Amino acid sequence: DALGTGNAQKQQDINHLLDKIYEPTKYPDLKDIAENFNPLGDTSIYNDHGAAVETLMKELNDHRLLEQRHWYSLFNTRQRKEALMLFAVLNQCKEWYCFRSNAAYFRERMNEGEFVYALYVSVIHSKLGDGIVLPPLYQITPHMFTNSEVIDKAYSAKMTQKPGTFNVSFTGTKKNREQRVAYFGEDIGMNIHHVTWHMDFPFWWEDSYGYHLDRKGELFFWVHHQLTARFDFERLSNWLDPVDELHWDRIIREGFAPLTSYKYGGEFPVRPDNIHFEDVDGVAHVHDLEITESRIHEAIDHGYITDSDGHTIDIRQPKGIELLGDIIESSKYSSNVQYYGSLHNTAHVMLGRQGDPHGKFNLPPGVMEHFETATRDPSFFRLHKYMDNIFKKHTDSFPPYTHDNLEFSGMVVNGVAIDGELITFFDEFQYSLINAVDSGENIEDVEINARVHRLNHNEFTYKITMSNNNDGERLATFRIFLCPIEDNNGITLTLDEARWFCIELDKFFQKVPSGPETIERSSKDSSVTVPDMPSFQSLKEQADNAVNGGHDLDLSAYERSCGIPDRMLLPKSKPEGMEFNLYVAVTDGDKDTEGHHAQCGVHGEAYPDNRPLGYPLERRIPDERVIDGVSNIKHVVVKIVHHL
Amino acid sequence: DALGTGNAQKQQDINHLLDKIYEPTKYPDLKDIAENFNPLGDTSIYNDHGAAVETLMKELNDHRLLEQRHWYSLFNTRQRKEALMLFAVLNQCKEWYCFRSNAAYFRERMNEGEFVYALYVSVIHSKLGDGIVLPPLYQITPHMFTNSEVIDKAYSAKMTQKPGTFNVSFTGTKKNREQRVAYFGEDIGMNIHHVTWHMDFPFWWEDSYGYHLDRKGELFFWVHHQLTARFDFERLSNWLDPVDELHWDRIIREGFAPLTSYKYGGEFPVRPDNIHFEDVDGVAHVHDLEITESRIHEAIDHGYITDSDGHTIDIRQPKGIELLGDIIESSKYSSNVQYYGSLHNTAHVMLGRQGDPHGKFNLPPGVMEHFETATRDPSFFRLHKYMDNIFKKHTDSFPPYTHDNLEFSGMVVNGVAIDGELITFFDEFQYSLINAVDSGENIEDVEINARVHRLNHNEFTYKITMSNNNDGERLATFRIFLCPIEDNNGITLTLDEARWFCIELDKFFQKVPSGPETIERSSKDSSVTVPDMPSFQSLKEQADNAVNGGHDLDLSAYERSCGIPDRMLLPKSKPEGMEFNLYVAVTDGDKDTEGHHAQCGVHGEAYPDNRPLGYPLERRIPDERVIDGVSNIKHVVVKIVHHL
Ligand SMILES: *[C@H]1O[C@H](CO)[C@@H](O[C@@H]2O[C@H](CO)[C@@H](O)[C@H](O)[C@H]2NC(C)=O)[C@H](O)[C@H]1NC(C)=O
Ligand SMILES: *[C@H]1O[C@H](CO)[C@@H](O[C@@H]2O[C@H](CO)[C@@H](O)[C@H](O)[C@H]2NC(C)=O)[C@H](O)[C@H]1NC(C)=O
Ligand SMILES: [Cu+2]
Ligand SMILES: [Cu+2]
Secondary structure, eight states, X not given: OOSSOOSTTHHHHHHHHTSSTTSOOOOHHHHHHHHHOOTTSOTTSBTTSSXXXXXHHHHHHTTOSOOSSSOOOTTOHHHHHHHHHHHHHHHTBSSHHHHHHHHHHTTTTSOHHHHHHHHHHHHHHSTTOOSOOOOOHHHHSGGGTSOSHHHHHHHHHHHHTOOEEEEOOOSSOTTXXXXXXXXXXXXXXXXXXXXXXXXXXXXXOOGGGSSOOSSTTHHHHHHHHHHHHHHHHHHHTTTOOOOOOXXXXXXXXXXXXXXXXXXXXXXXXXXXXXXXXXXXXXXXXHHHHHHHHHHHHHHHHHSEEEOSSSOXXXXXXXXXXXXXXXXXXXXXXXXXXXXXXXXXXXXHHHHHGGGOSSOSSOOOOOTXXXXXXXXXXXXXXXXXXXHHHHHHHHHTSSOOOOHXXXXXXXXXXXXXXXXXXXXXXXXXXXXXXXXXXXXOSSSOOOOEEEEEOOEEEOOOEEEEEEEOOSSSOEEEEEEEEEXXXXXXXXXXXXXXXXXXXXXXXXXXXXXXXXXOEEEEEEGGGOTTEEOOOOOHHHHHHHHHTTTTXXXXXXXXXXSOOOSEEGGGSSOOOOSSOEEEEEEEEEEEHHHHTSOOOOSSOTTSOOOSOXXXXXXXXXXXXXXXXHHTTSTTEEEEEEEEEEOO | OOSSOOSTTXXXXXXXXXXXXXXXXXXXXXXXXXXXXXXXXXXXXXXXXXXTHHHHHHXXXXXXXOOSSSOOXXXXXXHHHHHHHHHXXXXXXXXXXXXXXXXXHTTTTSOHHHHHHHXXXXXXXSTXXXXXXXXXXXXXXXXXXXXXHHHHHHHHHHHHTXXXXXXXXXXXXXXXXXXXXXXXXXXXXHHHHHHHHHHHXXXXXXXGGSSOOSSTTHHHHHHHHHHHHHHHHHHXXXXXXXXXXXXXXXXXXXXXXXXXXXXXXXXXXXXXXXXXXXXXXXXXXXXXXXXXXXXXXXXXXXXXXXXXXXXXXXXXXXXXXXXXXXXXXXXXXXXXXXXXXXXHHHHHHHHHGGGOSSOSSOOOXXXXXXXXXXXXXXXXXXXXXXXXXXXXXXXXXSOOOOHXXXXXXXXXXXXXXXXXXXXXXXXXXXXXXXXXXXXXSSSOOOOEEEEEOOEEEOOOEEEEEEEOOSSSOEEEEEEEEEEOOSOSSSOOOOSSTTTTTOEEEEEEEEEEXXXXXXXXXXXXXXXXXXXXXXXXXXHHHHHHTTTTTSOOOOOTTXXXXXXXXXXXXXXXXXXXXXXXXXXXXXXXHHHHTSOOOOSSOTTSOOOSXXXXXXXXXXXOOOOHHHHTTSTTEEEEEEEEEEOO
């Protein structure tokens, strides 16, 4: 601080705080704070009169909080509770003086993951964290994102003090599996979004924390339907077939070995292939799921969710799908959590100890019991294919849309063109292995680096040619889906068979002139995308330079970023090329935003589009006859090519 | 050398050679040799005219030998072949000039395990290696013997250059398993013997190498029957029940996670528990065993082994049990290896990839596919219980022994006493983690250490009181077994039910006076035991000091050591105490040694006792009525106590 603000301050403070995190801090101010401060002497800084502080001390006192240098999953009901207590202090600070103090005081005696986890969520949601950009998880705690080999290579770099970057690998016996569609799950970008997505709208949020995240519920429905489609496409491009939905009565056919290791903790357990699910002590019974899944499935089938009193709360209406998501992921918006439980989240802990359900070996938690690591394990997508059609069951009970339904009279797409080429290839990225190796003191830092291989495509532009027959200027929702065309059996599906498989590429609002415009728009301005983020270091360099320099840091570019990696914008496809189908449906802006970032409504911000999500492909479309004769929907085929 | 010998030379040379083994040598002479030498320019040093050298070069040339810094199991038919080529050069050296040369030349471009493995066997069997003591595997390549945690702790010591010893753990969730009888399998001593035992008498030996190991065949029968008994006792002392024999048609009920890691290689794969055996690609089919086991079992049942011609070679006679061992472990003394295959050894590779039989994950080999590590995994003893009663099937087909049979007329044991207490406790040991961490150069060595917890007992003495009624002085075999008494069901077995479960404590030859002697003998002089061995370092200190000093190193104390750890002499038992049964049978020395160390006949030396092995408890003993009425057999009960 400046006995306050700056941001190149707030910012600095943060970088110091998550610097070498597996070891006591080396920045002196952080330490006399660390020593000298007492979160309990001027309950005033606190808008709670410090009930939150007072609760953590209580526990840090009876020393009943998890130990340092030990692992942590966010699926542990206690670890979570402890991590979230830090969030509630940092939360009720009136100003930087209370935050730095506490994340310093605490940083130094609470465990690292509870700490990493609390500092981030807090920075993301609390009032006080505007100016900041968080360093990328992959560089702050590299063990969750780099391999096991590169990690050991970095440990040696360090033992010997000779530096250098190592090239990472990809998982199983490439050319032996479906560690062929690996590039997708294993990417530090998607892994970043996956974790952020759930830090932006956490399953544990209560509206006591301050505001209400708006439609987490549909937002949950949708985000995962997207990774499940996005995933299903990559498997198309690899001669692989759409994924199996998981069942509790069957073998988990496809198991994997992650080759990843914890920092403190041991290597991630592995799963043998063609295994039978076991009842995992502590978490829940396998049948416990099977009944949960039926209570679920009866709410969809009935038309109503029934709460605790036996009140039936109707869901055959638009808020529908969000009360279903509150009961299915199970977040605290659940109406009856004692009855519908928690399919999704239990299903994550349940798939993770398949390595050790009675816990005879005391293996650590597993790749699925963590967000920066689940997309690694193949059953991750088998498990969301199953959540995915629990939702479609509801999703599909609506009656199809009428002509009169999709029509935004006046507007009509004339043509759709791609100004450029759809070309995807494989780039190269480098993140840093330093917070991973321990350097104590008087020993100096050798710069170790990891180099990964990630997908990419080339910027391209949309030229959407189109006339407003209306008398004059109307607001427009430009919706753009890229659905597939044939099967992988070769078969050629139907906009019913394929409406569900399509992934959203862009959604934006523009005004339309009163006559033939020709809107053009960029790979680069997509609304579902996010650039790669600034390096850890680089945000140190920068933070530092505006401290000794006066003031700024306006890199607002990054204080939310909900989306997926720009690199992942289009699917991989084949080197021969495939022709996908592009759908531009343009709906009516005035009714869409008929009421209101608002992209990552991280802080209470009402999501702006009111149409439900996947509009208008979210509904059974039995006769294509129709999508086809509304002026404001047009489809054109595109073709993507893969450079070797 | 001294352009030869010494031993504090030969010795020095060796310590230099296995010093930091995961990195090019730092001892300069070793390097100009390494560079300058040509194993192919004075084929003269070679008793082969250097066909052996000439064969390794050939391969090192086409560079078709395994790479350095990669793993190695002795179960790999190629890795083995490559490791054993080094043995054949080092083997045909006329003097040190040829050995050092080669293990220097080679050390530097052949892989480490092939190298570690060749240098040891070579030192053990070749003519030229008399004076030496080998450093203990546990300190030369610590990754095979220390845990995964201590290993990582040592890696950190090194990163930061701050030293120190870490205390090791024990395996699963002690108080949750049968990682309660862990102290036994996991001991660096037994693991040492297990590997030595099979380096002393290797499965691959051909008598072209020079001499014939004498009864490896019975020697195999017996060594394993011993670990299987010794193991079965420890499980008695832990309220556990004797072990299950393994079958190929059933689930492997008891699986474990080893928590151990390779140096170059990844962590040891784990095994889930209640798994079904899969056909493992590359090694052999599961049924391939099931038939092997029948071809085996029919030789026992028939009375003959049938070779390649269809010759039936009889085995219902004393050489019996050794031709059976040649066919069962399958070593090269097999008469028909194309028919009886290799149950034992395949059974080791077969249990190891249970982690990955089609090899979709490319996990490394597993704890059972290695001798310094098999005793770790629980199916290790399930698998030797099954080999164990294949042998008993044959073992038991003989007719029981007659009175007239065991009687060594003249002698009679009067009494048997234990001068002291049978007390076993848990000591503490420290071996060194240095060859484990890499230190390159100009970086200096910090002394890292591992501390383990191992069993122990207290010296005690035998006072065997006994009269030679014979006219005068007769030679005697003093045989001493410690069999159990009751069940663990509480039941109280029979010297038929328990003859097989007893472990040998001592076997020695002494002359008996012509009248009442009273022989007393020590925990310490046992013939089946070996002291802990000298430290790595310590043999460096010592080697070095007699180099700059003139000459010696007579520590012959250690140039073979076949036995088990003195610490493991008696079983653990209970803290309440158990009464075991002690059997001293004294047979007739003149007929025993009716013909000839001779303990570890490492070099061709005829085993000296002629009685078969386990004499006289190796045969069905249907009426105890008999063992009981031969003067020279007496049994007394003892009682062992466990200090907490
Ligand atoms: C990892 O792959 C990279 C590709 O980035 C390789 O790094 C290259 O090193 C080679 C040496 O053969 C150079 O010719 C390239 O210019 C390098 N590129 C950067 C296009 O360094 C690297 O060889 C791989 N392996 C290590 C077996 O780093
Ligand atoms: C490992 O166990 C050893 C037992 O050898 C412990 O080392 C002891 O350190 C304590 C400190 O509490 C001393 O009181 C003992 O004198 C030590 N003995 C050697 C009988 O050092 C050690 O505490 C354990 N843990 C580390 C949690 O080393
Ligand atoms: Cu063995
Ligand atoms: Cu064996």
